[PDB]
Design a protein around this ligand. Structure first.
Ligand SMILES: *[C@@H]1O[C@H](CO)[C@@H](O[C@@H]2O[C@H](CO)[C@@H](O)[C@H](O)[C@H]2NC(C)=O)[C@H](O)[C@H]1NC(C)=O
Ligand SMILES: *[C@@H]1O[C@H](CO)[C@@H](O)[C@H](O)[C@H]1NC(C)=O
Ligand SMILES: *[C@@H]1O[C@H](CO)[C@@H](O)[C@H](O)[C@H]1NC(C)=O
Ligand SMILES: *[C@@H]1O[C@H](CO)[C@@H](O)[C@H](O)[C@H]1NC(C)=O
Ligand SMILES: *[C@@H]1O[C@H](CO)[C@@H](O)[C@H](O)[C@H]1NC(C)=O
Ligand SMILES: *[C@@H]1O[C@H](CO)[C@@H](O)[C@H](O)[C@H]1NC(C)=O
Lengths: 230, 194, 97, 37
């Protein structure tokens, strides 16, 4: 019964995604961040081909053809120590960052499974709000999950009561909350406001009107009597 | 202010519970949301709504036992005091590596500069720089591995805030042994107590 | 009671003072090592911004700041030592203290 | 901001909302936004 509304909000939100990607600089902040992380990793790697590490230079040709061999062997040993520590540093931060990328990718596989291939009941796992369905986008060196979430918007206030005992039997909500606008008591699901009349279909009996505090009196109707009336 | 976020988390959990982690805070009595958190573990709400004094007293006695074990047992905060100690030993090893010469004449800069002219002071200071620089890379890479541990436990603490404080986790033994009802953040130093 | 770590102590190192405290030529040779402390400090700064991210992903799970009302009829659940006490200047709670 | 200048203030942590808590107060959202996060 709100299909046009959900469709139009989805379309407006994906349009806002377009606008944010076009306008906001770090709209791809995580993936542009990772691409830049790779770029600076490689660029530091290459600039370490301009670092001395104690050697005379870094372009091996001038080490070889600038000075005498007897200590050129030692100097090229120092240069290769520096380059090999640079490559080990690069590879171990590639391993740490690939553990980051593998946590991100196990999270993106878990997100594909529980967000795209299914619905995740984990709170804030597929975006803030109650996740509906994610959409993968094959973004560069990553994935963009269009986390279609349900975010409830227009709050209110009502009067509530833990149980509603009709004639000495405490009634409880099967799934939802007992609420009232001030004179009539309604049961509503916990995440969106439908005032529903109180009946044994959505209320069950356990106990009495004394063992529970906050319990108020209200009629819990029965559908058999009106049907039997005629 | 970390404790102010923690107090806001407690206030939202008591007053709203899970509904403040989706959007705005939706006020709800504490008995209501405790009953709903029983309902979320396959235990009916009537269990609390008829044993409310028992659940409240067991909760109070259990948190009293928590305070007693904290005041008495030294390793009550085993994980967080453990991590604080890992930070302390990491920094202290880093500092004492300034007392390590790594095979050089000395580990103090001024004596190295004064005793030797640059001809060999260059080699000695190179040894100090490479030793303390491997010390910095070693320290920083174990800070990266330990921050991957702290980020795994912080993504776990954010997942646990979301699914334990901001909601109820149906994952078995994710928010403690037994069927989770509700967690409470307590911003102990350099961490959180759930 | 699960004691989860959230944030390491946020540490930033200046090699020109750490490796080369009150020494100038040491900083010159550290530069002669190319660029390790630029990326070392960027690693540590990523760690520190990561600690702030950790803290605000754990604790800042909500935009607002909610206050517990002075009347606390929480069905009987005593949160006195759980909720903060207005007596301490550096406000915490008894359990948190 | 204030013309507009640079201001150094204690961070608000967000608006100091006081939840309208009581043993009978309940809030329910009457509407929602489809948020494509
Ligand atoms: C909630 O628990 C606190 C304990 O943390 C209670 O305060 C104690 O109450 C006892 C008995 O009244 C006193 O002997 C202690 O001196 C109190 N200690 C403190 C630190 O206040 C408090 O009364 C409890 N509140 C309720 C409503 O049960
Ligand atoms: C509902 O009414 C109470 C007064 O009983 C008030 O304090 C509260 O702010 C109202 N709800 C909202 C969302 O303002
Ligand atoms: C509460 O809702 C019922 C159901 O329509 C209505 O009859 C009644 O007038 C409402 N009362 C108030 C105070 O809004
Ligand atoms: C609810 O609170 C009000 C005021 O705080 C009090 O008068 C009333 O007796 C309480 N009712 C229950 C069931 O706790
Ligand atoms: C509900 O009704 C019973 C008897 O009809 C009475 O004893 C009790 O006080 C009533 N409770 C309320 C909250 O009106
Ligand atoms: C609900 O929110 C939408 C926008 O998200 C708005 O267009 C609509 O008027 C609101 N109310 C109803 C009853 O849909």
């Amino acid at each position: 019964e709100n299909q046009k509304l959900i469709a139009n909000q989805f379309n407006s939100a994906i349009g806002k995604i377009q606008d944010s990607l076009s306008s906001t600089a770090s709209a791809l902040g995580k993936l542009q961040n990772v691409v830049n992380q790779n770029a600076q990793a490689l660029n530091t790697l290459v600039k370490q081909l301009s670092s001395n590490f104690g050697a005379i230079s870094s372009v091996l040709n001038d080490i070889l053809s600038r000075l005498d061999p007897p200590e050129a062997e030692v100097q090229i040993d120092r240069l290769i120590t520096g380059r090999l520590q640079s490559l080990q540093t690069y590879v171990t931060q590639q391993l740490i960052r690939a553990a980051e990328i593998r946590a991100s990718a196990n999270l993106a596989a878990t997100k594909m499974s529980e967000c795209v291939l299914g619905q995740s009941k984990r709170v804030d796992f597929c975006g803030k709000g109650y996740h509906l369905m994610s959409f993968p986008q094959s973004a560069p060196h990553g994935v963009v999950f269009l986390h279609v979430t349900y975010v409830p918007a227009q709050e209110k206030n009502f009067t509530t009561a833990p149980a509603i005992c009709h004639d000495g039997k405490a009634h409880f909500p099967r799934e939802g909350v007992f609420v009232s606008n001030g004179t009539h008591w309604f049961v509503t699901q916990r995440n969106f406001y439908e005032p529903q009349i109180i009946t044994t279909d959505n209320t069950f009996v356990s106990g009495n009107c004394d063992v529970v505090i906050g319990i108020v009196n209200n009629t819990v109707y029965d559908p058999l009597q009106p049907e039997l009336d005629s | 202010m970390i404790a102010q976020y923690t107090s806001a988390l407690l206030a939202g959990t008591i007053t709203s519970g899970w509904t403040f982690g989706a959007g705005a805070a939706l006020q709800i009595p504490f008995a209501m949301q405790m009953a709903y958190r029983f309902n979320g573990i396959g235990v009916t709400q009537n269990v609390l709504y008829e044993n409310q004094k028992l659940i409240a007293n067991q909760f109070n006695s259990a948190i009293g036992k928590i305070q007693d074990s904290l005041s008495s047992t030294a390793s009550a905060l085993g994980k967080l005091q453990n991590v604080v100690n890992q930070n302390a030993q990491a920094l202290n090893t880093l500092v004492k590596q300034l007392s390590s010469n790594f095979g050089a004449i000395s580990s103090v800069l001024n004596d190295i500069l004064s005793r030797l002219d640059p001809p060999e002071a260059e080699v000695q200071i190179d040894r100090l720089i490479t030793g303390r620089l491997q010390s910095l890379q070693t320290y920083v890479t174990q800070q990266l591995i330990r921050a991957a541990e702290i980020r795994a436990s912080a993504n776990l603490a954010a997942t646990k805030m979301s699914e334990c404080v901001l909601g109820q986790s149906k994952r078995v033994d994710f928010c403690g042994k037994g069927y989770h009802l509700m967690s409470f953040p307590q911003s102990a130093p350099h961490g959180v107590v759930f | 009671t699960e004691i989860l770590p959230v944030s390491m102590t946020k540490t930033s190192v200046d090699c020109t003072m750490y490796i080369c405290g009150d020494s100038t030529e040491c900083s010159n040779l550290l530069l002669q090592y190319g660029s390790f402390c630029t990326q070392l400090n960027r690693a540590l700064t990523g760690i520190a911004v990561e600690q702030d991210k950790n803290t605000q992903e754990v604790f800042a799970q909500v935009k607002q700041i909610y206050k517990t009302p002075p009347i606390k009829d929480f069905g009987g659940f005593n949160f006195s030592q759980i909720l903060p006490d207005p007596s301490k200047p550096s406000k915490r709670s008894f359990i948190e203290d | 901001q204030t013309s507009q200048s640079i201001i150094a203030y204690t961070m608000s942590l967000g608006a100091e909302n006081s939840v309208a808590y009581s043993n009978n107060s309940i809030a329910i959202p009457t509407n929602f936004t489809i948020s494509v996060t």
